[PDB]
Structure formats: C-alpha cells, structure tokens
Design an enzyme around this catalytic site. Structure first.
Site, PDB file in Angstrom:
ATOM      1  CG  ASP A 163      -8.988   4.576  10.860  1.00 31.43           C
ATOM      2  OD1 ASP A 163      -8.674   5.591  11.481  1.00 31.43           O
ATOM      3  OD2 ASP A 163      -8.932   3.457  11.446  1.00 31.43           O
ATOM      4  N   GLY A 191      -3.261   9.502  -9.551  1.00 32.46           N
ATOM      5  CA  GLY A 191      -4.630   9.967  -9.219  1.00 32.46           C
ATOM      6  C   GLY A 191      -5.806   8.956  -9.057  1.00 32.46           C
ATOM      7  CE1 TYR A 238      -1.632  -7.807   3.685  1.00 36.28           C
ATOM      8  CE2 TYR A 238       0.709  -8.361   4.183  1.00 36.28           C
ATOM      9  CZ  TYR A 238      -0.558  -8.724   3.656  1.00 36.28           C
ATOM     10  OH  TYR A 238      -0.732  -9.985   3.118  1.00 36.28           O
ATOM     11  CE  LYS A 269      -5.104 -10.280   5.521  1.00 36.90           C
ATOM     12  NZ  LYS A 269      -6.008 -11.310   5.014  1.00 36.90           N
TER      13      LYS A 269
HETATM   14 MG   LIG Z   1      -8.258   2.729  13.335  1.00 34.40          MG
HETATM   15 MG   LIG Z   2     -11.936   0.606  11.258  1.00 35.46          MG
END
Ligand SMILES: [Mg+2]
Ligand SMILES: [Mg+2]
Ligand SMILES: [Mg+2]
Ligand SMILES: [Mg+2]
Ligand SMILES: [Mg+2]
Ligand SMILES: [Mg+2]
Ligand SMILES: [Mg+2]
Ligand SMILES: [Mg+2]
Ligand SMILES: [Mg+2]
Ligand SMILES: [Mg+2]
Lengths: 379, 379, 379, 379, 379
Positions: free
Chosen positions: E11, E99, E219, E222
C-alpha cells in the site's frame, strides 16, 4: 361392520360477532350427544368449533341422510340457540336454523362404509370461506402427484380416483376420473364458487374416500364447510392429505363473505378427548383470515378415538407465517378486485343503492357534452 | 458399579396413521416397567415416543443382548398391541412384532459400562428416517472439530475415537479411527443406507461412547432409530453432542420411507419425570418432516434422573424454522430424485407394475420407426 | 430503614452436564431460606437458576460482606451438594465449594442502602459467561445516551455516574466518572476479561446504583455472574436498564469457557412468587448460547415482592431470534479466533500437549532446509 | 418451408478449471460458423456458453442426424481445441472430442419441422448437471396444470402430449401420453439418472415440441445438457416454458459430478445479437451451483432473430436468491447422501481404494471378538 | 518448463484515506511491468487492488526470493510513490516502503513449480485484515471434508496435505500433516495472530499447493495479505478453493487494525485482461468490512491468461448479504471485546495515556476507604 360418520355443522351464534363461539355452547352440545349415545341413537361423537361454526361429528349405523341423525343435530342446534345463544344475545343467534337438514343452512358431510381393519379418518372444518375452498386441497390429495406420492409409487393407487362435482348454480352432477380427466376436472373446479367437489371415490373399487359439505345455491349454499377424508391403504396417507393444505391458498369468504384471502391451517386452542370437545381458533383481523382445523381419529366399532390436532407441528408454523404475511399484503388492496370478490360472488353489495343515486350518461352522447358536464360539476 | 442402559423401541400402532401414538400406550408401558422394577428385573426406566415410535429406556445390570431385558421389552410391546393397539384398531397395530429382539423389527441400542462419578447420558429417538440419519451427527460430535471443540482444546480428547461401521447389505464390520482414518470413514458412512455407525468408543481407553440401533437388511433394517450417547469427561460435552444436530440435514425416510427431507430437532410436547413418561412430537405434513428428540439424564446407581428435553431452547427454534422452510422447498419437487429416493433405496415402488404395462422399444430399432410409432399414437 | 440486598450464586451440580439444575435443588434451597427467615437471619429471599447456576437472593439488615449471610449461603450450597447433587451424581457436584464466601468460587453481588419510598430493583443472572459480560450493558444503562434517555432529558441524571472498575489481574481499583471520563473508562472496560465494572454509584449523592459479582483472578474469577441494579428516581428507569440488554452482544464463555457468542435475554420457564422459586432457561447447543435472565422486584421493609420476568415480551423475541441466528453464524467458524477465545483467555487448552509433540524448526535455518524437510515428510 | 434447428454442445476447455470458457473460444466458433453460412452449409447460427460448455445453435435444411452439420460442429470444436484450448493449456482442453457426433461426448438436441407463421423457440443450456435435470421442467411445462395453464384453459392443448423416454442403462425407449399415463411416466422419469425425456410431441398432430440431449451411458452420457423447446399455438406459451424453471429444484452434478444442488436460472453476462454471441454465467462455489440459461428466438426462413435472455427479470431474482440460500444449506452436509450422490450415480469415487486398505470383519464372528478387537486398536 | 508465480503487494497510498487506490497508480504499475516484460525480466503480469493495496502478480523463471523480481516490485512501488502518491498527497503515501523485499512492509507470496499440462491458479488479495485471515479458508480447502469433497471421493487426494505454519512471535516453523495431525494443527492456527499457514504442499509428492504472505512480527507483519493457490489434478478443484470462502468468517483488522469483522468475498469493479488491470472494491463503513477478491488464471509457458473474477456469481451474493448483516450486528458492540481486539492484538491503543491519568487504588486497601473515596468524588 358398516359404520356411518356424519359431520353436521352450524353457526347458531358468535362470541363476539363472528369471531368465536361461547364455550358453554360446546359443553351443551357434548352433553346432549352424550345423552343420545346413552339411548343408542349414536355410537360416539366429538364436538368442536373453528371460528363461529360448531361441528357435531357423530358415528352411527343409520346410514347417510338419516332423519333421526339430522334431527338429533337440528334439536341440539335449536336447544343451543334457545338455552345459550338467545340468552346471551350472541351475534347471529340461531341464524343457521324436517326431516333432511340439507339446504336449511347447516352443513353436512357424511360417508358410510365397511370399517377397515384400521380406519383412520380426518375431520376438517373451515371458517370464513365456501365449500369450494376445499376444491384445491381435494384435487391435490387425490390427483396431484406433487402432493400425493402414492399416486406414483403405490401400485394400489395407480388407477386414481372418481370426483363427484356439483354445479351448485344449475344443480347438475358430473363424474370425472383422474388421471385421464384431470384437465376437464380442473376446467370445472377452478371455478370454485360454481363447481364444487362433493364426494371422492376410489376408482379401483368405488370405496368412499371423501365427502365435502356442499348444497345448491338458493341465501344458502356458501356456508362455511366441513370435510371428511379417509386415509391410508389405497387412499392417501394422513400426511398426503395434510400436505394438500400446506400451501395456504387464496379462498373466497373472509370479511362479509366478499373477499379473497389465504386459508391458514390452524391449531386448536385445546383438544379434550375425554370430554369429547375441542376449542378451535378465533377469527380476528378483517374477520379472519379464513382458517381450517384438522382433527384425526381412529375408528373401532364406530368409537372415535381422538381427536388429534394434525396442524400442530413447527412445520406448519411456516405455513401459518406465510398466510399471515399474505393476509397483510392483500389487505392493502382495500376495496378492489381481486381482493374484493367479483360482483356476482359477493355476499354483501351496495351496487343497487349506488346506481339509484349516481346519474349515468349514455357514452356516445357524453363525448359531445363532456365539457359542459364538467363545467356544471365545477360550477 | 457396572450398569447397562438399553433402549428398545418399536412401533406397535399409530394414532392416527403414522402421526403419533395413543397416550394409553405410554401409560401401559410405564406401568409394566414399574412392575418389572418392583421385581428387580430392572433398576429404572423411562418411556417416550417421537412420532409413532415408543422407546423403552431401561437401566439394569444384566448386560448387552440379555434375553430377559429383550423379552421384557417384547412382552411390553405385545401387551400394548393386544390390550390397546388392536382394541382401538390403531394403524399398523402390532406390526413391529425369542430370545434376542434384534432383527425382528424393534430397534435396540445398548451400552454397558462402569458408572462414572458423574454419568450424563442422552437418549435420542428419530421418527420417519433410517439408522444412517445419525451418521452425520455421530461423525460430527466425535470427529469434526467445527462441532466438538474438545477435539482441539481438551487434551483428554486428542487421541480421538473408534467407529464401528456396519455394512448392512453384506453384513461386514469395519473399525476406523479418527482423526487419521476420517476420509476412509467418510467414504463409507456418506452412503447412509449401506454403511452405518453402530458404536463409537473412546480411543484412549476403549470406553463405550455411543450406540446406534442398526441391523442388517433382510422387510427389516431401515426402521426408525434410537441412539444413546455418553457425555463429558473425555467424551463430547452435552452441548457438543447437541451441536451435532444443529444443522437439520437431509435424511432418508419421510413419506412412505421413500423421500429425503430435513431432520428437525423437536421439543417434546410434555416430560413427566415422576410418571417416567414423555410425549414427543407428531408427524404431520407429508408424514413428517422427520424429527429427532433428545432427553438427557444423569445416572446414579443405575437410577435415571431426568429426562430433560435438550432441544428446548430458543436457539433451536432457528434450526426448526430452517427445517420447516427446507421441507417446503424440497416438497415442491414432488416425485423426482433427489427428493424421491434412488430406486433401490425406496421402501415403496410401483416400477414392476409400470414396466408390466408400458411397451418398450429397443432403442436402435426405435430410431428408424419413430415416425410411425408417433403416427400410431396420434392415430 | 436501611436494607441490604445480597445475591449469592453457585453451581453445585448440573442436570445434565452444565445444561440446567435439578428442580429439587431449588426446592431444598428455598426451604432452607424459609427456615432462616423464621429465625430472623434474613427478612426475605428468592431462589432461581439460569442454566446450571443457582442464585440465592436475600434481603436482610446485616450489611455487605456479612459472615452470617455468606455462611447461610455456604451452608445452603453445601447441604444441596450433599443431600441432592452427590446423591444424584450431578455433573460438577459441589464444585463451587470461612467466613467471607468471595474468592472461594461462588459469586456475590450486594448493595446496602436506605429503602426508598418506592424501591424497584432488578436481579440478573447470566450463565456461560464471565463478569465482564455485563460491562457493555452497565456502560450503556449508566452512560450511553442512546440507551438511557434520562441522561439527556431528566435533569436529575445530568451529573452522571461513578464506575468502580476492578483490574482482576493486578488487583487495582479505578474510579471513573461519566460523562467526562467515558473514553478512559471504555479504554479499560472494553477489555472485558481484565477490567470489570464492579459497582456503580450515582454522582449527585454517591448512592449505590449497581453491583456486579467480580473477584480477582487466582481457577476462580471467571465464574458466571450475577448483577443487582436499582432503578428509577435519578437512577435509570427499569426500561432503560432492560434496553441495555436489547442488543445480544458477543460475550466470552460458552462451550468450555473458551468461545465468544451472543448473550441471549431469555425468559424464565416458570416464576412462582408464593413458593419464592423461578426456574430459568437451559443451555443446549454448544452448552449455550450464553443467556441472561432478569427478575424485577419492589422492596417494602425489605420484603421482596416479585419476581417479575422482565424479558417476557414479544419485543424481546426479536432480540432472542437475532441471538439464535448470530449463534448459528459464528459456530460455523469452529476452532478459530475470534470465535475461539485468545489463548490466554481460554479456560480449556491443549497447547502444552501439542508443543510437546510437534517439532519446531528455527525459522532462519528452516529456509535452507525446507526442500529436504518436505522430502522427508513425503518419504 | 421445413427447417432443422440443431444445438451441438461441447466442453473443449475451461477457464479456469471448469468455471467458464475463454471468450476467444466463442469468437473463433462464431467466425467459423459465419464462414459455413457464407458457403450455404447452414442458414444461421448463435454461439454461447453456460459455464464451461459452448453451445453451437444452427439452423439449416439438412435434417436431424446430418453428417455435414455434425461434422461442421466437430471441426469447429477440434479447431477451437487446437488453436485456443491447447494453446492456452485450458483445463480439460479438447476433452469432449465420424460421422454422427452422438455418443462421442458432445451433446445434441435437434428438431425438424415446418416453420410456423410465427416460430418462437427457446434454447436452454445447463452446466454442472445431467440430462435428467430437465426431466422435472419438461414434465411440468407439458403435463402439470399448475405450470401450464393452457392444458386446462386452451382447448387446443386438451389432448396433451407424447413423451419419448430413453432408459439410458438398458437402451430402451418408452412412449407415454399425458394426461392418462402421467403416473407411469413419473414412475420412470423420477429416476433422473436412468429414465430421461429425450423428445416431446404434440398428441393432436405429432408435431415436435421439445428435444433434450441425452445418450445411452457407456465415460459418456451424463454430460451437461442442452434443450430446445418450441412454444405457443397449441404448445406451451413462452411464459409456461419459463414457469417450469421457476422452482430451482435439486439436480445431480455440481462438484465432481457427484453431488445434488439447486438449478439456478441465470442471466447471461452479455448477449450480442449482431456478433451472434452470448457469454453465460460462471460456476464458482463448489464448481456451481448448477445453472441454466434460456435464450429465446423467432425464426424466419430459418434465420434466427435473437437471442433474448429470458431469465432476465426481477421476478427471477427471487428464484436465484432461493437457489443461493438452498446451495448454502445443502453444502453444510459435506460428504453425506443425499447431498453426495448415491454411490453408483457419482462420477468420482475412492471406494475401491478404501476397501483395499480397511479390514473387514464378518459381522457374526465380530460379535464374539469385539472386545479384543477394540483392545487391540486401543493397544 | 519450470515457472515461478510471484505476488508482491504494497500500500503506497490510499484514495481517499484507506478506502481505495487512485486508478493512475494501477496504470503506472502496469506500464512499468510491460516495460520489464519487454526486457525479458518477467514473462507476464497482472496488476490489481483490493481496497488500498496494489498486488503485482508476475510470472518469471528466476525462482523464489529473487532479488531482481523483488527489486522490480520495489522500484515499481517507489516510482508510484514519487510520481503519483506524493504528487496527489494520497493518504499513507509511500508508507509500505535491498535485496529481499520481505519484512520491509510489502507482502510476498510466491511458488515455483513445473507448469502442469493445465495449470489453473487463483490469486487472492484481502484488505483490512492480517495473514491469519486466510488460516480458516486454507484449512478448509486442504483439510475439511465438508469443504473439499475430493479428500473423500478423489483417490488422488486421500493422503492429504503438509502445512508449513509460521509462529510469527517466536520465529519457529512447524510442519503438520492432515488428516492425522488436524487437531494439533488447529490448536495452533486457531490463534490467527500468532500461528499462520505460510505454505501448503501435497503429501503424495511434495508439490507446492499454496503460499500465503506472512512475515515474523517486528511495526511490520500484520499487513494485508495475498495468497496463491494451485488447483485441480490432486489439488482442490477451483470450486473447492472458492467454497472455503463461502462462509464470511470473522477476521481481525478492519478499522485501525483493531477490530473483528466478517470477511466479505467481493467482486471486482472491473477486470481488463488486455490492459492487465483489475480495479477491486472499496472499503467504506468503518474502513471495511474486510474484503477478499479472487482472480483465476490459466498459465501457458508462464503467460497468464485471465484474470477471471471468481466471486462473481449470484450464489456469492447470499454470502455478501450475510457479511453485510453480520458487519451491522457486530458494530453495535462499539468499543468492546470481542468486536474490539484483545489488547495485545490491537494496532491502535491509548491504554498508556489512560493509565498515566487515572489513579489506581490497591484493591485491598480500597475496600476500607471506598466510602471516603466516593464521598470525595461526590464532594
Ligand atoms: Mg492504507
Ligand atoms: Mg490495506
Ligand atoms: Mg357467524
Ligand atoms: Mg363461520
Ligand atoms: Mg407407523
Ligand atoms: Mg416411526
Ligand atoms: Mg456447571
Ligand atoms: Mg454456569
Ligand atoms: Mg469442464
Ligand atoms: Mg460443463
């Protein structure tokens, strides 16, 4: 031995309105039949209501259309009327009232036969509907292979059934045999207010399989019906009979005998086999919806062991919830067909009062004058 | 002490049809077992029906397959038959009827064990289905970790269970152990009319955990089953046992023993622990749907404290509503597989009568002659 | 006058398993409290169960944490244990068992106050859950304006409430005041297994408004809770208290004390205000779902007029149907979080047995050797 | 003029698995049929899939069982196989593959007739089921008066229909006529995997009314079917044909050809009457549920005007929601009959592998030795 | 030939918030992969998002954990970040960023194998959840016989599967084999935030069957997962894979990474196989609910034919409606466990800020002083 089973039903007063019966009415009837049994007029009995209709179920050995049995029912209903209904000023007191009771208002369904080695029978009573309410369930249990699996998988049932159909308008009887005549039969009994199944016989041997209370129209004839069905052993199983009520189909009747609504298969409030009395359901919203109760028995030497409430199962709660939701949907149509019945099928009308007060215009001349007629209403 | 718990069940007459039993039948049975308890033949008992089947639950110290216990059940069912079922001409009177009762029609489920410091057990009875109806719940409660959380989180259950599987067609027994044999086991017991779980044992110590009534096929063997399960303490918790019935799965049976429909976990109409009698549910639409009742007990010195109706919870009302709606859906299929059973699994058929009347055409020659055969039917 | 109301609850045996209690247990307890009332130890009492937990509700004038009242409850539970639970070998017989009963297993909720000119109170009992099950309803009825309309429209309630929060792991108490501290309060009591509301006070005057049974963790402390709430007159209305249970929220407990499921607000099976006994609901599928019962009283001179089942309304049938459908949805997750509890919150685990048998591989070295380790398992 | 309408269907590769077809497959087929139309081999065509099956609908004047038409379909499927399916390594590439195509794997449904003054026809395609999936809809639209109101109210339909039934196991044809033979007919076609409706004719004149693709069993014969039905004008109305699919009845097939699940009437994803291509629905959960698509046409001089997606109506969304909920219910049965098919009806089995590894015990001897066999498994 | 299929997901900015991605992000990524394919770095690719996560699916022949492939993904995500995410100030711009890319934030799932004669694979992407969201579907499709019928009826699957389980807290790998190890396996992977299935292999031959993106916790760890599964031919059928998502089970994640809610199987908004881009669903109420998308492919010489949206079926609309209703139910719990996660599992907390401001009282001393502490708060 040969036994006759007779249901004679009448409404001689409601409590309140047409919602229910007064319980002392059932208790009076049961005491009177107990006395008749003591004198040997009848063998056994059971008394119950659905809504505002009291059914006297009686077994005896006097045959169909017996004056003593029909008179015993007449006297029991006249005594209930004078002792209880008139005393308490019940609504419609004594209104369903020599020597055949048929055509006077009360309804009769009777069959005589040799008592089989097991003789299971079911007595039905419907309130707020007409005898043709039972056309669709009787067709299904004797002739629809989606209802009665025996027609296909029981070689004893493969030859089908004979339906005696009464045209209650022209007073004509038709005998139709399924499977081969099923489309002709449906062409008639689909018109539930005219062509009504009165009796069904087994085709293999002519044995009586059902009897529905129906009389020619004369105002008598659309009264709330009662129905006897024998089951098992070449006749539909008890469950196939009950399956034919598992879709709560629209029937004619309900408020003022002038609407269509779903036939709900209802439980009895109580069944007391010792006192020989069952108390059926009430009619509430819009004087219904229409409801049918089913009590099972086993006969021995004409004694009635039962009754057993045969719509008392969680599986039928689904069917009652469907009927409650369809009653709410259809009622939002108010005064319009097809919720309100076709004009010649309704028990209530004000059409003569209307047509006496509202001015007609021949439609051809009206075209030229519309503008002035509207200007006149406006001014 | 060591105790035997035995359920011996039979249908010796229905009321009406196959819908229910007559209550005097239960009262007669309970009185007869009370007398046997007085003479020390048995320690304790409980009598109940689901549908048209009466289960005699008895505790005693005579062991499994005891002629006196099996004879006590036979005499109780023969006495009910002569005194009540034949008297009232009940339907199927005495029809399930030295010295093992197994294979004569009645069903038996029994276990002997050392009575634990708390000994909770559950007795089940199903009507309108076959012993393999309990294959899916028995698998789930002993081997599905989505049902029995103890298999994963109780170190006393980690070793699993031994299933004794009876091939009722070729009369062969298989012993399969879960978890490792679960796919083989399923390969067999998925065929519910052939491979049926008869007993389950704990793998850690060989302790008896369940017993299902099942006999080789001979017409006997598909009769409505009864099942005993011990719970807690290395065996599934009472709630894990009941969880295995919380999906109302399709079973074979229902009308005429020839259809598939959902197994509804039903309440008893009444449970009277003092009189030692419970009255189970009726079978109504289409002679069902099939239903199972569950009565819990706690044993002490062989005395049966209970029974407790363990499907009596609003949470199971959801499961009963699912079964009522699935029964309505499936019934709209009428006579067709898979609602109607595979032809060699149905109890009822008219296939020989059909094939005797309907002319076959070898399919190769039929191709050339189709036009003339259709012209012939048309003309 | 000043009165103390005390609920002391214990499970001293289930019937069967953890599903229910034996009715003789309640009758024994009620007789023993009747005797105590005769000697003036207590003023009045009511005895009931929800599931397998028996609550002794007692009013008296001995104050909170009284050795005689706590001993009267201990002796009543020990007598039930020896006379009934052990006799019938009930499951978990006597397992919840000088001179404070707190921390020994039984649960206590008590409040002392001046009896108001009308003193309505509600006693709750939950089975198959932990004291923190009541965190969400207690927050809602004292601090959510979507539950308790009085917080906004009753000027007597505008100052809010004081929550006494017990950290049951480190044994620390926090006092938080709403509205201003609501986010801090939630930061704590959202963790229902650690921070539990133990008491609530009115902020205007410090009056006791609720008391929940909760003890530090030691295995004791997650036992099924009991809760007293006073209502009206500056405290939430009886309906605002009951509104806080109208969403059947997920709680911890259910099977093996190791799962999450919806808290169903259940009716009592029967309430007998003369005999001073109510019989609560059973726990069935998966040993639940968890359920809470609510009995209302009005106090006069410490006499308990009631109880009244306050979840007995068709409006709560919607809420019970929601909980039945959510119990079915969540159970399809089987052994996985968040249906199964976090590993340090579960009452049952086999993790040590697993980790003793299954070989670990340090993850860095495992990367190089994966192919050979898989080849080894394969071969 | 006389016209032949032929559907020839095959699965020559899925995308992915058995879920769907690759769109270039349809485009290749349509181009090849366009070329054939240019050379006058055929008059018109339409190409579509439901699931992983491509139907080639073709009109022409070469009659039924024509080698050139069957070869045109074979060459089109072989070309799709080599050019597209093998190139993209589709799953089951070319697996349904002189000079009749019947019995080689592809399915054929064809009818020849005089083109009526209006000639409406409907082409159906089902995926994940067997030819007997169409037994219940074909019975209903030609012989159930609850589906086809014309049987009762259209005097042109009163004489009923002739069903040609193929026993695919013994290779025998039966001709049965409704209404009179309806119970015999059902006795056969209720067994959907054995007795399958292959053709239907009007009884008045012998006119072809439907043709279903079905071949004797040999592994070929349970392949996903295709069906042509002519409508109106003495044949069921288009809506009566579609009404016969409005209950999503359980069919055999679904995952691995070994389960029962509801037949969902699905919309096409797109219909392009100019390009002569429709893209049908995918198969997803558990490789289904099974689905049927319906494309309507009007013929003129053999030209196909259409297709029109005839399940594209909010009224059929109710029927799709019923099938989605019944697929979820039945799938919770997992590996058990009647969700899993009877053992001789399943396409997949491991029963020989199981019975080769699991030791049997003759059941009589097993009784004496049970204790030692269990002790052995335990030790 | 041997092929590697790699999903690398990150993301690098949401649009708006965490609801979705900007479409120019997908277009930029696809152009960059097109260039890489031109230079022969990769064979083929597909780019898509679910929520705010972009998955780069790539096929190539460089093997697992290849620096050039992991660097190609890093450079594509860094370029999207600088050219698009930072330019438009997207929310969380570039936040998932030599890498090996593993453990830096982006998620990787990769498998290398010999390309089968048909090679169907499914790529999944979930947003608003953790890698252990796929524990329950992976268990079901490889080891629950209620999901994967092949385990029972496909002799090629009877030997089961090997699960590689990563303890992400202590960095330890476990190999467990089903069926025999299923209870141990569940004992671990039921704790979804600790023990996560990382890979699955076929037990017969060690063939890679699935790979889930999961890294040790540091972190990072997860992050929203991606999963590759191969299907058919001894591995679960495509439909058995999809069946394992047909119950929308509760997962951890949703708002702030700190709640539990149902995993909804969602359709893609659009799939463009020519442009190699699919646009997945948005996250809306409460930043979810969590959703998973499924794209099917068939591989040939490493070319990706697809993707096909495999939750695009009316049957999955039932499952989406269940998840929408369960999201509404659970959200009414607000801030409380088990809707809010256990305190050590939540991504967001203010517990240190709370405990810094709210005064604790040691619980023993608090008992004596309660009255004065409440008087103090009151005054
Ligand atoms: Mg996001
Ligand atoms: Mg997401
Ligand atoms: Mg009246
Ligand atoms: Mg009436
Ligand atoms: Mg019977
Ligand atoms: Mg029975
Ligand atoms: Mg307990
Ligand atoms: Mg408890
Ligand atoms: Mg295929
Ligand atoms: Mg197919």
């Amino acid at each position: 031995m040969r036994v006759t089973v007779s249901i004679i039903k009448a409404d001689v007063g409601g409590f309140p309105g047409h919602a229910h019966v007064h319980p002392k009415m059932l208790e009076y009837a049961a005491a009177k039949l107990k006395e008749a049994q003591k004198r040997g007029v009848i063998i056994d009995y059971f008394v119950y209501n659905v809504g505002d209709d009291i059914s006297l179920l009686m077994t005896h050995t006097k045959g169909e259309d017996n004056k003593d049995i029909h008179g015993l029912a007449w006297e029991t209903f006249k005594e209930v009327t004078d002792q209880i209904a008139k005393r308490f000023k019940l609504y419609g007191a004594g209104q369903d009232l020599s020597g055949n009771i048929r055509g006077m208002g009360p309804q009769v369904a009777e069959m005589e036969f040799e008592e089989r080695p097991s003789e299971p029978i079911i007595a039905f009573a419907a309130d707020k509907t007409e005898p043709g309410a039972f056309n669709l369930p009787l067709y299904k249990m004797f002739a629809d292979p989606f209802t009665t699996a025996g027609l296909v998988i029981d070689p004893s049932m493969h030859e089908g059934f004979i339906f005696e159909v009464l045209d209650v308008v022209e007073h004509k009887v038709y005998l139709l045999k399924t499977p081969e005549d099923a489309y002709s039969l449906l062409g008639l009994i689909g018109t539930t207010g005219r062509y009504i199944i009165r009796k069904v016989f087994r085709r293999a041997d002519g044995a009586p399989a059902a009897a529905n209370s129906v009389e020619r129209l004369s105002y008598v004839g659309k009264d709330d019906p009662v129905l006897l069905v024998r089951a098992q052993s070449g006749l539909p199983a008890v469950g196939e009979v009950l399956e034919a009520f598992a879709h709560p189909h629209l029937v004619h009747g309900w408020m003022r005998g002038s609407h269509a609504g779903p036939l709900m298969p209802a439980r009895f409030i109580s069944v007391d086999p010792e006192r020989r009395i069952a108390i059926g359901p009430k009619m509430t919203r819009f004087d219904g919806p229409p409801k049918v109760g089913a009590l099972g028995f086993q006969l021995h030497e004409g004694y009635l062991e039962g009754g057993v409430d045969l719509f008392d199962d969680p599986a039928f709660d689904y069917v009652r919830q469907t009927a409650a939701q369809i009653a709410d949907y259809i009622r939002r149509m108010g005064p319009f067909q097809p919720h309100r019945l076709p004009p010649e099928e309704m028990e209530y009308t004000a059409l003569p009062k209307i047509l006496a007060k509202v001015k007609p215009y021949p439609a051809d001349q009206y075209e030229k004058d519309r503008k002035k007629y509207i200007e006149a209403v406006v001014k």
